[PDB]
């Protein structure tokens, strides 16, 4: 989105020193020229709507979500005056109106738009706006707003005038209270709309580069070309991070099961299309001459193949052992599909397949669970080893935590032990927490009452339930001693088969 602050203020209805910019009112100056509130969105941030509102004290907004800079120019020209003057309040109101009009979750960039020449005393606007160093009871105030934006108060005048009016001083104090909302007022003299444009030009943070690149893939009839630069992530710092560039080339190597494990996360959309370079001098990977080569056959476009029938996925491994699979579409008479993609940028591209730093031949193959056929599906290994994201511990950061955990432990038959492989593990975590914390003291209420609900039958019943629940109750009471006790947390209690029934 976009945020525009039209300073419709009575204070902002007079010249700066002698006369207005375009020898006339502020409306004429706004019509003649504007700041970077719309130029950046026009150039770079095309997918953005603006809320052309001129307001000081109340949300006198009439412009809905729209990118028309003409409406913004009309609103700025319509920002004659009002019955208020407060730069920070105007910035807050402009940000709120832009969020409420252009889009709730769409980011924007608002700034402070007011004159501020009220004078230190009974009518200072900074006193009633810069209120952040107290009121602990109302610490969750509107500042900061739920949108990333740095409100900036424009300043282009003499240093003595800026200090007497306390514009730069109040702006710096507001920035310090708001933790950086406002750049350093490093400007003086008769300056045009350059400092204001620089301070308001931060609304083009979602730009893109419409470029192209090529790659060489030997003498095969199905080549691949690298996509644009990917999004940087914390994977390997090395010397220092930097924005990526057009990659040289990749290599389509390897073949794994398609539907069994799918593929790691993609970095960009890169189509599969063959190229050629044999003896044409420098030989660029092959303008609109593609129709002639279009008549020539190539299996890059028809790379569906064994994606569904035999269960195969075209794996591509880069130069620095950056392996990664990719699946294709099944329908061929209808619209098919083929593409290229990268791997996950985390510590492991395929956490369900172990470490993948040894993308190489089958001469030293440790295991072949799939073998491009999905013959076996032992991954993920449910027992013992697993990722650290889903350990045997409960989470109560949110409201649906421990209080709901006790009920879930009491009603474990609904969501256990059917999907115990990788999804349903709340009951095991709750039982592990109960066995670890030693909740015998708190068992008289709801902390450890889950087991008693499952034992409402007599004591002369079948011993399968007693055998199942013997370990947890025995291990739990040892933690109250305050010494060495049971450590059944690395080992996981898995779903035991209930085959004791007669039917």
């Amino acid at each position: 989105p976009t945020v525009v602050v039209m300073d419709v203020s009575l204070s902002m209805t007079r010249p700066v020193s002698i006369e207005g910019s375009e020898e006339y009112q502020r409306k004429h100056l706004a019509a003649h020229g504007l700041t970077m509130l719309f130029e950046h969105m026009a150039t770079n941030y095309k997918l953005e709507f603006t809320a052309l509102v001129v307001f000081s004290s109340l949300w006198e907004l009439m412009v809905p979500f729209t990118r028309d800079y003409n409406t913004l120019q009309e609103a700025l020209s319509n920002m004659d005056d009002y019955d208020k003057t407060c730069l920070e309040s105007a910035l807050v109101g402009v940000c709120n109106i832009v969020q409420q009009e252009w889009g709730g979750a769409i980011p924007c960039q608002v700034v402070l738009v007011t004159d501020g020449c009220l004078g230190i005393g009974r009518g200072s606007l900074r006193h009633s706006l810069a209120t952040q160093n107290q009121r602990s009871e109302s610490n969750r105030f509107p500042l900061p707003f739920p949108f990333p934006s740095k409100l900036y108060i424009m300043c282009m005048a003499n240093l003595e005038e800026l200090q007497s009016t306390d514009s730069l001083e109040c702006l710096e104090r507001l920035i310090d209270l708001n933790n950086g909302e406002g750049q350093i007022f490093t400007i003086d003299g008769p300056l045009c709309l350059k400092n204001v444009q620089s301070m308001f030009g931060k609304l083009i943070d979602l730009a893109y580069t419409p470029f192209h690149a090529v790659l060489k893939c030997g003498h095969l009839t199905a080549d691949v070309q690298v996509f644009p630069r990917p999004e940087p992530f914390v994977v390997d710092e090395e010397i220092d991070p930097i924005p990526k560039v057009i990659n040289t080339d990749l290599e389509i190597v390897g073949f794994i099961d398609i539907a069994d494990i799918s593929s790691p996360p993609v970095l960009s959309r890169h189509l599969v299309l063959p190229i050629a370079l044999n003896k044409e001098g420098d030989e660029v990977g092959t303008n609109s001459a593609n129709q002639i080569a279009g008549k020539i056959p190539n299996f890059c476009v028809l790379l569906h193949g064994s994606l569904k029938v035999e269960g195969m996925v075209a794996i591509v491994q880069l130069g620095p052992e950056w392996h990664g699979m990719l699946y294709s579409q099944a329908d061929s008479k209808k619209k098919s599909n083929l593409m290229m993609s990268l791997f996950e940028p985390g510590p492991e591209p395929l956490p369900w397949l172990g470490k993948m730093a040894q993308l190489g031949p089958i001469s030293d193959a440790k295991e072949n669970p799939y073998g491009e056929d999905d013959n076996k599906s032992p991954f993920p290994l449910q027992p013992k080893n697993k990722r650290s994201y889903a350990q045997n511990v409960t989470v109560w950061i949110k409201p649906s935590g421990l209080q709901t955990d006790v009920q879930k432990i009491l009603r474990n038959a609904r969501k256990l032990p059917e999907k115990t492989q990788t999804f349903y593990k709340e009951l095991n975590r709750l039982r592990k927490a109960a066995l670890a914390f030693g909740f015998l003291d708190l068992l008289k209420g709801v902390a450890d009452m889950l087991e008693r609900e499952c034992t409402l039958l007599p004591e002369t019943a079948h011993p399968d339930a007693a055998f199942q629940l013997t370990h947890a109750a025995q291990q739990l009471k040892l933690a109250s001693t305050g010494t060495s006790e049971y450590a059944a947390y690395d080992q996981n209690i898995t779903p035991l088969h209930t085959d004791f029934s007669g039917s």
Binding site: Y208, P264, F299, K335, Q391, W396, T422, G445, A487
Partner: protein, 552 residues
Amino acid sequence: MKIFSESHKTVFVVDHCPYMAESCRQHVEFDMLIIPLAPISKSLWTCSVESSMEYCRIMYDIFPFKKLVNFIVSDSGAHVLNSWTQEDQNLQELMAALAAVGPPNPRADPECCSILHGLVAAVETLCKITEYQHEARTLLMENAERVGNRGRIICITNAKSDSHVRMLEDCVQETIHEHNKLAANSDHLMQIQKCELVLIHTYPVGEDSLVSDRSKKELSPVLTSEVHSVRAGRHLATKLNILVQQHFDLASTTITNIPMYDVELLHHKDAHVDFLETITLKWCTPRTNNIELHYCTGAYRISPVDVNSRPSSCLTNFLLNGRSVLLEQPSKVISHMLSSHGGEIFLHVLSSSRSILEDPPSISEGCGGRVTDYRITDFGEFMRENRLTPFLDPRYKIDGSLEVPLERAKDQLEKHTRYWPMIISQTTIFNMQAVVPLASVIVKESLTEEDVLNCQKTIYNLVDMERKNDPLPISPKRDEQYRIMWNELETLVRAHINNSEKHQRVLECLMACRSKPSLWSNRINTANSRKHQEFAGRLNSVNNRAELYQHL
């Protein structure tokens, strides 16, 4: 410099002293639609330790291998044990160590009822060589893990007064420093030149309160003291959520429309790309009904907090299978993404552009277009030598000394594309079975001088066929089909001529058997220094003269 992550060290400390054993008036009734029916005297310290352990588990899920942390609680004794394995880094071993250390106990020992042993246990719980080599870890955790959990030590006690609280804190700090020095006695750990402490204080609800309002400040150079107040109930949940968000600079997201109660979705600080980050969007299961294509950027592990609820658990189950979750507002645009693995659950922040991965509906007019009858023989021959399968680590299996498996795989991929057009629809000579051997031998497992001999035999058979004067089908005159086949063979061999010298030699031989086709000083120095270059005659002149036409 990759070993300086925020999750280097994290320790949650819970004690069993009579001061912390006081009732917190925590009662929760689950009865709404052989022991006496005592009231549930749950302690607020248990909930605080649970929140700190959850934050530590999230920290462990942030760095799974490079950084490892453990959890140990306080008791009458002290059991300290730590390892350095990557697999054990998960929160299961931290919970096991916390259980093995000691849980809360109302009846303490008759003597040594203090927090010195608890301070030693917490210092041992802290990672990076038991808080001895953790100087740089605490230096980084001055605003990261401090905003997350405790990190150093969490001493919960019923302070009688400010003086008693300060004295107990000083004793705990001295015990922690002694334990850190004891750890520093080893070789991998270094003695603490500087100390940084982040202290978490817990008190029961409805208990004594003799603490005055104060801000966070480094009270002493030896130990920096911090005091915070946490309630029981919704306030505890809000504080834990704020701590989790501040741990990694995360946000909150809700997932709806499960394809069959707060909803939060954690992430790392990689959301700055998709900002100008509370993602408000539904959830999409990857299938035919809903668009399964969306951009993914900055994968980072997510530990759901609201798993004990239908929506969050359903979303976790859907994402954890391996499907790619798309995003839509709550031409297609996706502002979010979600991918996960078999045990790892993660969330992604997506840019709003480039969600058109499945763009081409037809491929008739593209390069290499409306011909899908590609050469199955060449692809099969390449597959004959193509045998790639990764292992845990590379190993030397074949000749050429300690061969790197990546190098061998690259060579196998290169050999698959030497001279082997895997597209048969272009030409008409692909009908013959004796010409395919040249394309196969380049990519077969037996590529050697014997393969060149087999190619020579194929060329001899082709020469016999040419001498036989047999027209061939094109699938116009037979000469046009023959010219097309010859041009296709030349095109196939042209890429091989630049790929290897043997193919170039074969092409040269075939061509050989081809037929039927100080002001004075500074000013004078500036003037002389501005001169640019001399020439040959001046430096080599003798007696102000130099000879010409010396070549004679």
